[PDB]
Design a protein around this ligand. Structure first.
Ligand SMILES: [Mg+2]
Ligand SMILES: [Zn+2]
Ligand SMILES: [Zn+2]
Ligand SMILES: [Zn+2]
Lengths: 49, 102, 141, 559, 160, 133, 264, 86, 196, 114, 65, 43
RNA sequence: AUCGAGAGG
């Protein structure tokens, strides 16, 4: 019934937790706040596979 | 003696309005025996109700506002804990300033 | 053979999914009043159908019986308590020498089972007993 | 902040709690293992040496015993294993670290420590299992529950320190709280649900149950009360037997709705000279209400008579309920077939009222009212239409519930339940809401990818037509799960915010003490109030009472 | 606002009046405007009321906002507890805050001030300014382990 | 020590209310068309029905522990077939020369209105009810 | 037949008797089912000494299972409580010693039943200590299971006790007990949707009592005197001897109060 | 500053004894009782050092006096014989 | 706990004779309070007692799957086919007196779980014991025979009571009280104290 | 780790008398009897028989805590009737019904053929 | 991990019934509810003792040591 | 053990709320409470 | 001891 998917380090079973992040190489527009000198921002975070 | 007269002033309005002469005799037909007893319970129950010196009340006051706030949860004004955090912080840029004019 | 597709969250913005495959059935009264109220879909430009709507849940909330009749934080509260329940975590518990292990003497498969339990092997490795429960008021304990 | 303003302490204990109906209010059920561990230094005197010498002889491994012995030289004699732990001969001026015993004063604690009424003193009652036991009617100031909570126990080590718990921090002294100027403790749970069933006009008690019910009151005059029925059979009223627990000299007048002195529905309450006259006892009478029976007896008789009053109501009502019984089950969530028809057609005509308004805004026939947009007037008129329809279904459900419906009986007693719990379980759970609005358009112009774009219908924006008895549809599940998550985050976020608020409050006002000239000052001596509360009163023994001179016509004032 | 007001008979009656509620605040120009009652005007922004209408009017406006967030939830607190808090925010010159820049910058000794926030930074300037502590604070005696002048220690005990 | 009231009444309306073994009663004094009563009555014991006409008595005797009847040595005060014990709590002056009595028999209630018991009933704890067929 | 309580037996078997108890008050027939559960004594295992155990179970797991086995105890009155006898730990006047040893010789799975328990101590001619077997295949209760190469060897002491101390010493299973099937004394308030009569089911004992006439009012002073019981036994004590010892232990228990009054 | 006493005729503090000076009076007495001190009341079968002082107080035999302080530093001494209890 | 967020510890253990019972002699393994039902709105717990009851009698499995056409009305028909009352109620008798319970009790099998929190792995008491090295305060944890913490939230609770003399003893005589010699000129603990 | 041994439910120990008898205060012919190592099987059977004695005024029992197997029994009697004789007659009156019940069942079981 | 001796609730033994129940299912080709009725188990407290039981003992025997 | 193997962490404008996109990819109910509620999600 | 992770109300 053991499903696997885990490691063994020094006899202790260990799991890698999935890590959630925002994707790179996407294009998003943000309304800046009311006391901001600029009105808007288009952003991209450029990543490389 | 002025501060003493100021402090009991609301209570005496309750006293005279209920220990009034038509009221004592027609509404609840007291005898002289019962009336003199009521004058002695009231003087005791009041003098027992006086606060005791040494009572730390600011901690009592702070806890007495603190606990009902922990049970607070939810017509478009800042209510509850953000308003309560607005009030206590002397927040200048409060989220819903309003003006009730008459 | 092109009978099933993999859809992520982005591609699912351009599709229309049914629920039961009975929604794809053409229909043109006498109903069970005790049965719940499903609206007729009134939309028919379907591209996909859900496999089963009960597959939106994880492995812990799939243990829960009748979670559609439950206020939804209770399903959350239960889903963290099923990881505290005691049972047979592995059939080789006697061989393994873990730091802590708790095993039920006489585990029982539940009398009320999710249909997703069979893929979770709960009826093969259960973690509770079917206790005879009386909801009663009796001495006040 | 962590080693001076608060630190870890000796003579402390903590374990899981549960409740005991056969415990008094000021008592705490201390386990024997905790009692054998906790000591109190007792100096030997002629009044105590005959008990203490037997205690030392009884040894640390059973109760009651001692653990150490301190001579005038000041060297501890360990009784766990010494040569002379059996032949000791006590000298005056010596200390015996004896066990915590019955009716010792201990401080009982529950965390978080918001109230003064969360760190109250108790009487020790050494009991033989693993849990901490306490009375049922002390949960509310502690905010305790027997779901897995632990509570801390605290032992004093000086004679005036023991006097400090019993004469200030004791449970009966804290029955009326300065916060809210009202009692914090009242009859709860099965005592409350049974005291309504017992006090019905139709509830009559036979002689055999009566005699057991009289002896169950711990203080008792031995006077069998005269039965309220004589000739066909000597029956008793449930009001007649309950009034034995109410001490004589108590008056309680209260009127609700149509409180004729005929009282056709047995509303209100009239208690005269420790005897009840008319009225079903429920939460208003015997709860923690202002002007309640607990508020009376704590003033009229005293604290110790009110603390003893809790058990005598508990021991009688629990016994009557033990032999009567109570339950719930699904059957008290089922309403009538015709009532289900009236609910499922009520929601349908609410589905028509939203469609017709939506088509009205679709054709731009809108009276642009001032201050809000065209969309904002649409959203308010659909949210309000759907909250009206959920309530109209629940009020349609509460009416169909008969007098024997157990959820209704818990609502009537005030033990557990509210209107909305009847409505969501049996009528319609209602309309879900994230961030205050309706269900948002998380997908592009839709809520779920099973709906067409631009669909502002009730079922597309989180309205749950079905009930918990009926069963939510899978879209209705996810919108409900969306709504409940906000409440889980709100519970999780408000808790850390409110703890920082209360700490800033206490750390600002911590030296505020009524001085001996009654002027509220601080550590520096600066005046804050000249009279505390501007009248110089303690907040307990202050009750609301109408000023009769204000209000009313000038004509009726004069007459 | 269906306000209750005395009838000419003397009894109280409900008198519905039209009331304007705004979405912004400037006190000093709105209250000097014809058509309104400038004796009844009310701002939820109590800090503005402090500088238009005196500090004593800010205190009673501060209490009315605190009382409303409790009464919004349905709870009750006695007057003396809120008004105690409301007085301490007010009993100085202006509005003194319950945050680290507010009461903890007062003249309240030193060691009590270091028990709340900016623990080490307060004790630094206290040694540089050569502060002297009265040691009448609760927190100073809690730290020192002495019996603080609380209710039991307010007085002294003496032989006859 | 003796009888304190005697009359015969005819019933008008019997009302169960929310209860299942008690009924509120509404009846007028027969051969005395100016006095009426209102009383709460156990109906599983004495099933008072509509169009009945029944006698009513109030005694003052015939504190101390209620001992059960040992035998016939303990003799009744009643050829009657329904008896309660109660307590006066108020006396309402309806008008000048018109009075009302208020009785609770452990929550079972009674209101009695007329003006010839002015010499009889009093603000005393003691009260008995007696009703004959 | 005799003055007082009267019994008419409806049905009987080796395994259960169905009977009617009549002209008895209520608290008696209650106090009879209470002693029939847990104050008449039996013999069961109360100490297990283990030698080897290569099985997949734990020793306390099988030791708990061993005590739950029904052993014969018809002649238990000749056997004395071990705390009352003067032996050092256990003798033949106060105890019974069983033994159990098995080996997985077969490649097939080898079971262990309660017939494999072998008595060792001197029985001294009383019907005592035989494991109860009502299984129609001769085997007993299935205690353990063995693999090829696994063995388990232990000795068990069986003592005297009551189910008040542990439920293994329980000679009975379930005491069916219903009085007044028609609800004529109004001892309970039925819960209903429309008709309490159509909702709730007619009990089987409704046949043995008269149907009430709706015109006649509530009998206000009748009490309950006629109770319907079905006592089921495990097999350690035969069914007739459950109630008879239940009667007798109730008799024996009152007399201890009576002789304690004499000592006062 | 230099002897900040108060004459007994001019005393505005409460004639009644506060609970906070009762519990210290009852406590300090039960302390010195527990370390073996004489007792000024016929103890009708009572051994508890607190219960002695509670019965010692209803007969007003405790020879102690509360030095009630004022915020300027002045004080008013009140003997337990003067102080009322309720 | 059950499978529906309903937690709860054990208040008391009752033997089977003290326990209430049905007319077939069936005894509850477990007794829970009805007051923990309406505020929590765990209706599926209540439907579990129905479907499991029919499951044990019929010898079938209970299809408690979500999003099915399984109704409380459809379950209850099957229960009345088995001679029990459709809403799960059963007449119960008191175990003490033997008198019938006036209320009929919702009775059935229900899946219940055993959680890792057991009292005997939680009981902790401490008179005197080991101290920490630097702070000279009691150590942390039952597993090291430690002390409970009298936090500032709990000190805040002691000022409201005015228990001034308890609060000193529990801040000093009950942990890390200590004595140092100081000088009258330099007001610091820089004096040297040769004691004997 | 704290549960008392299960034999304490029915084994007297350390000089615990089976019966303790104490006179009732503010009462006449009234006495209370702390029974020991006993439960509802014996207490509800004595009290139900005391009510059948016409010269018995009051009879009631209670368990002050279900942790412990003990109960208290209070009897009030007619004057000139020692309450111990009311208990003694009723204790003896129980056994007559039981002995007749045992004889009646045995007659019926011997008549039964299975 | 194996058949309990008796039902928890009532105390009627059930351990003698396990091997027979499986032959009523397998060999006699019977459904479950009639199998539990053939074994003399008529109370549902008894009846859930055998129906809901998972015989994990057969998986423990597969490990060789 | 199955639940521990399919669990995501979200280290840190409304991240905790059950978003509409989570349908069929993330369990709506199963998530921890209090400290980091909603950030920890189960597949 | 420190630093972590998980967990309970
Ligand atoms: Mg909890
Ligand atoms: Zn022997
Ligand atoms: Zn120096
Ligand atoms: Zn069973």
């Amino acid at each position: 019934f053991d499903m696997g998917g885990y490691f063994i380090i020094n006899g202790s079973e260990k799991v890698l937790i999935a890590q959630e992040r925002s994707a790179g190489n996407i294009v998003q527009v943000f309304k800046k706040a009311a006391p901001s000198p600029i009105s808007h921002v288009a952003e991209i975070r450029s990543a490389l596979e | 003696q002025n501060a003493q007269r100021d402090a009991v002033t609301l209570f005496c309005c309750l006293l005279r309005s209920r220990l009034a002469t038509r009221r004592v005799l027609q509404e609840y037909r007291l005898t002289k025996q019962a009336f003199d007893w009521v004058l002695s319970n009231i003087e005791a129950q009041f003098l027992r109700s006086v606060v005791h010196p040494g009572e730390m009340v600011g901690v009592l006051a702070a806890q007495s506002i603190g606990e009902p706030a922990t049970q607070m949860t939810l017509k478009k004004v800042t209510s509850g804990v953000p308003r309560l955090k607005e009030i206590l912080n002397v927040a200048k840029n409060m989220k819903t300033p309003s003006l009730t004019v008459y | 053979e092109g009978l099933v597709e993999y859809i992520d969250a982005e591609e699912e913005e351009s599709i229309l999914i049914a629920m039961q495959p009975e929604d794809l059935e053409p229909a043109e009264l006498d109903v069970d009043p005790a049965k719940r109220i499903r609206v007729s879909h009134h939309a028919t430009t379907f591209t996909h159908c859900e496999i089963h709507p009960s597959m939106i849940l994880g492995v812990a909330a799939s243990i829960i019986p009748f979670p559609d009749h439950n206020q939804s934080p209770r399903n959350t509260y239960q889903s963290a308590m099923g990881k505290q329940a005691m049972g047979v975590f592995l059939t080789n518990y006697n061989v393994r020498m873990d730091t802590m292990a708790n095993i039920l003497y006489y585990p029982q498969k539940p009398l009320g089972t999710t249909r997703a339990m069979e893929y979770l092997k709960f009826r093969e490795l259960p973690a509770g007993q079917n206790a005879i429960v009386a909801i009663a008021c009796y001495s006040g304990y | 902040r962590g080693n001076l303003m608060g630190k870890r302490v000796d003579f402390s204990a903590r374990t899981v709690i549960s409740g005991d109906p056969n415990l008094e209010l000021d008592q705490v059920g201390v386990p024997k293992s905790i009692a054998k561990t906790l000591t109190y230094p007792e100096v030997v005197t002629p009044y105590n040496i005959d008990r203490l010498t037997q205690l030392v002889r009884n040894g640390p491994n059973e109760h009651p015993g001692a653990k150490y012995v301190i001579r005038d030289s000041g060297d501890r004699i360990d009784l766990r294993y010494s040569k002379r732990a059996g032949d000791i001969q006590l000298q005056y001026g010596w200390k015996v670290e004896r066990h915590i015993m019955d009716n010792d004063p201990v401080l009982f604690n529950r965390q978080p420590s918001l109230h003064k009424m969360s760190m109250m003193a108790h009487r020790v009652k050494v009991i033989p299992y693993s849990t901490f036991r306490l009375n049922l009617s002390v949960t509310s100031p502690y905010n305790a529950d027997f779901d897995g909570d632990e509570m801390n126990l605290h032992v004093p080590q000086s004679e005036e320190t023991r006097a400090e718990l019993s004469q200030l921090c004791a449970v009966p002294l804290q029955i009326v709280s300065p916060q809210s100027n009202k009692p914090c403790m009242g009859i709860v749970q099965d005592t409350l649900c049974g005291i309504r069933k017992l006090t019905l006009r139709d509830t009559f008690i036979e002689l055999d149950q009566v005699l057991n019910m009289l002896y169950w009151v711990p203080d008792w005059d031995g006077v069998i009360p005269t039965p309220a029925i004589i000739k066909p059979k000597p029956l008793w009223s449930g009001k007649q037997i309950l009034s034995v627990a109410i001490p004589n000299g108590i008056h309680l007048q209260r009127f609700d709705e149509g409180t004729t002195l005929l009282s056709p529905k047995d509303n209100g309450m009239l208690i005269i000279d420790g005897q009840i006259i008319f009225g079903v006892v429920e939460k208003k009478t015997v709860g923690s209400s202002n002007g309640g029976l607990i508020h009376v007896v704590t003033r009229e008789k005293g604290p110790q008579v009110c603390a003893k009053l809790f058990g005598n109501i508990q021991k009688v009502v629990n016994f009557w309920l033990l032999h009567n019984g109570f339950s719930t089950g699904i059957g008290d969530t089922i309403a009538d077939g015709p009532t289900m028809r009236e609910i499922t057609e009520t929601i349908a005509e609410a589905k028509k009222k939203v469609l017709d308004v939506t088509k009205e805004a679709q054709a731009n026939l809108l009276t642009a009212k001032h201050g809000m947009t065209l969309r904002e007037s649409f959203e308010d008129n659909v949210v309000r239409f759907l909250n009206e329809a959920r309530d109209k279904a629940g009020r349609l459900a509460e009416v169909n519930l008969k007098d024997l419906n157990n959820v209704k009986q818990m609502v009537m007693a005030g033990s557990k339940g509210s209107f909305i719990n009847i409505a969501q379980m049996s009528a319609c759970v209602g309309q879900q809401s994230v961030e205050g609005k309706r269900i948002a358009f998380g997908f592009v112009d839709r809520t779920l990818p099973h709906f067409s774009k631009d669909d502002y219908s009730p079922e597309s924006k989180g309205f749950v037509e079905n009930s918990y008895l009926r069963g939510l549809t899978p879209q209705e599940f996810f919108f409900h799960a969306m709504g409940g998550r906000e409440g889980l985050i709100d519970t999780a976020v408000k808790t850390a915010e409110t703890g920082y608020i209360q700490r800033r409050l206490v750390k600002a006002l911590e030296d505020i003490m009524v001085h001996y000239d009654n002027t509220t000052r601080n550590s520096l001596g600066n005046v804050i109030q000249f009279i505390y509360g501007e009248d110089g009163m303690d907040a307990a023994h202050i009750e609301k009472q109408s000023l009769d001179t204000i209000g009313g016509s000038d004509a009726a004032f004069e007459k | 606002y269906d306000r209750k007001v005395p009838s000419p008979t003397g009894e109280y009656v409900k008198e519905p009046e039209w009331v304007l509620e705004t979405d912004g605040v400037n006190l000093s120009e709105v209250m000097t405007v014809p058509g309104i009652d400038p004796t009844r005007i009310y701002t939820n922004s109590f800090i503005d009321i402090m500088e238009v209408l005196g500090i004593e009017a800010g205190r009673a406006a501060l209490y009315k906002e605190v009382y409303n967030v409790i009464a919004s939830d349905g709870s009750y607190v006695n007057y003396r507890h809120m008004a105690l808090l409301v007085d301490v925010m007010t009993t100085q010159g202006g509005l003194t805050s319950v945050t680290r820049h507010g009461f903890n910058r007062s003249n309240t000794g030193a060691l009590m001030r270091c028990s709340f926030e900016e623990t080490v930074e307060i004790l630094f300037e206290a040694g540089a300014s050569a502060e002297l502590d009265d040691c009448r604070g609760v927190s100073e005696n809690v730290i020192l382990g002495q019996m603080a002048p609380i209710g039991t220690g307010a007085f002294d005990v003496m032989i006859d | 020590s003796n009888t304190l009231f005697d009359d015969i009444f005819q019933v008008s309306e019997v009302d169960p209310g929310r209860y299942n073994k008690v009924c509120r009663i509404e009846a007028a004094s027969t051969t005395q068309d100016q006095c009426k009563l209102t009383l709460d009555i156990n109906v599983e014991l004495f099933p008072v029905a509509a169009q009945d006409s029944l006698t009513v008595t109030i005694a003052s005797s015939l504190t101390r522990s209620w001992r059960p009847p040992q035998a016939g040595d303990r003799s009744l005060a009643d050829d009657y077939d329904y008896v309660m014990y109660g307590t006066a709590y108020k006396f309402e002056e309806v008008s000048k020369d018109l009075i009302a009595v208020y009785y609770s028999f452990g929550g079972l209630l009674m209101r009695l209105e007329g003006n010839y018991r002015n010499l009889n009933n009093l603000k005393q704890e003691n009260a008995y009810l007696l009703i004959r067929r | 037949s005799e003055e007082g309580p009267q019994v008419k037996i409806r049905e009987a078997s080796k395994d259960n008797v169905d009977f009617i108890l009549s002209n008895v008050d209520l608290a008696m027939a209650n106090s009879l089912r209470r002693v029939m559960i847990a104050e008449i004594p039996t013999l069961a295992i109360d100490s297990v000494e283990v030698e080897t155990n290569t099985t997949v179970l734990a020793d306390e797991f099988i030791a708990h299972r061993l005590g739950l086995i029904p052993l014969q105890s018809m002649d238990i009155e000749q056997l004395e409580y071990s705390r009352d006898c003067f032996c050092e730990d256990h003798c033949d006047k106060c105890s019974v010693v069983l033994t159990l040893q098995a080996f997985g010789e077969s490649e097939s799975t080898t079971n262990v039943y309660s017939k494999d328990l072998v008595i060792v101590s001197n029985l001294m001619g009383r019907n005592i200590g035989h494991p109860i077997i009502q299984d129609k295949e001769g085997n007993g209760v299935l205690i353990c299971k063995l693999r090829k190469g696994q063995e388990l060897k232990l000795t068990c002491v069986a003592k005297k006790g009551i189910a008040k101390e542990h439920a293994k010493w329980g000679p009975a299973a379930a005491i069916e007990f219903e009085y007044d099937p028609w609800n004529k004394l109004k001892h309970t308030d039925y819960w209903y949707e429309q008709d309490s009569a159509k909702e709730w089911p007619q009990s089987k004992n409704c046949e043995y009592e008269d149907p009430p006439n709706e015109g006649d009012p509530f009998d206000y002073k009748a009490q309950a005197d006629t109770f319907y019981m079905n006592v089921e036994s495990v097999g350690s004590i035969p069914v007739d001897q459950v109630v008879v010892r239940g009667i007798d232990t109730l008799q024996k228990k009152v007399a201890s109060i009576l002789l304690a009054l004499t000592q006062m | 500053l230099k002897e900040k006493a108060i004459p007994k005729d001019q005393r505005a503090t409460t004639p009644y004894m506060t609970k906070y000076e009762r519990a210290r009076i009852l406590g300090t007495r039960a302390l010195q009782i527990s370390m073996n001190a004489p007792v000024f009341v016929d103890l009708e079968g009572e051994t508890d050092p607190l219960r002695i002082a509670m019965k010692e107080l209803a007969e007003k035999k405790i020879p102690l006096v509360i030095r009630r302080y004022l915020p300027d530093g002045s004080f008013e001494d009140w003997s337990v014989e003067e102080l009322i209890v309720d | 706990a059950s499978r529906h967020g309903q937690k709860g510890t054990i208040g008391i253990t009752y033997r089977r004779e003290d326990m209430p019972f049905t007319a077939e002699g069936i005894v509850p393994d477990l007794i829970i309070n009805p007051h923990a039902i309406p505020s929590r709105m765990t209706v599926a717990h209540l439907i579990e007692c129905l479907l499991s009851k029919v499951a044990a009698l019929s010898g079938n499995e209970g299809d408690a799957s979500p999003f099915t056409d399984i109704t409380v009305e459809g379950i209850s028909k099957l229960l009345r086919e088995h001679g029990y009352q459709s809403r799960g109620f059963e007449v119960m008798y008191n175990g003490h007196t033997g008198k019938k319970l006036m209320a009929q009790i919702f009775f059935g099998p229900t899946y219940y779980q055993r959680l890792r929190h057991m009292v005997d792995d939680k009981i902790h008491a401490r008179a005197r014991g080991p101290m920490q090295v630097l702070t000279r305060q009691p150590v942390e944890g039952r597993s090291r025979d430690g002390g409970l913490r009298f936090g500032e939230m709990e000190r805040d609770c002691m000022i409201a009571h005015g228990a001034a003399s308890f609060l000193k003893e529990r801040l000093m005589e009950a942990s890390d009280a200590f004595r140092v010699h100081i000088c009258g000129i330099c007001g610091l603990m820089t004096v040297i104290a040769k004691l004997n | 780790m704290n549960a008392p041994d299960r034999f304490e439910l029915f084994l007297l120990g350390e000089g615990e008398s089976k019966l303790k008898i104490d006179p009732d205060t503010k009462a006449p012919n009234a006495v209370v009897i702390t029974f020991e190592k006993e439960d509802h099987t014996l207490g509800n059977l004595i009290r139900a028989e005391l009510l059948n004695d016409r010269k018995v005024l009051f009879a009631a029992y209670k368990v002050e805590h279900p942790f412990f197997a003990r109960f208290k029994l209070r009897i009030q009697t007619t004057e000139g009737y020692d309450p111990k004789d009311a208990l003694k007659n009723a204790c003896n009156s129980i056994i007559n019904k039981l002995g007749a019940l045992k004889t009646n069942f045995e007659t019926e079981w011997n008549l039964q053929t299975l | 991990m194996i058949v309990p001796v008796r039902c928890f609730s009532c105390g009627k033994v059930v351990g003698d019934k396990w091997e027979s129940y499986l032959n009523l299912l397998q060999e006699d080709e019977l459904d479950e509810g009639t199998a539990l009725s053939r074994l003399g188990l008529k109370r549902y407290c008894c009846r859930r003792m055998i129906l809901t039981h998972v015989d994990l003992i057969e998986k423990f025997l597969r490990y060789n040591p | 053990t199955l639940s521990h193997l399919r669990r995501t962490n979200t280290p840190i404008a409304k991240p905790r709320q059950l978003h509409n996109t989570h349908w069929g990819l993330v369990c709506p109910a199963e998530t921890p409470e209090g400290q980091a509620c909603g950030l920890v999600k189960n597949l």
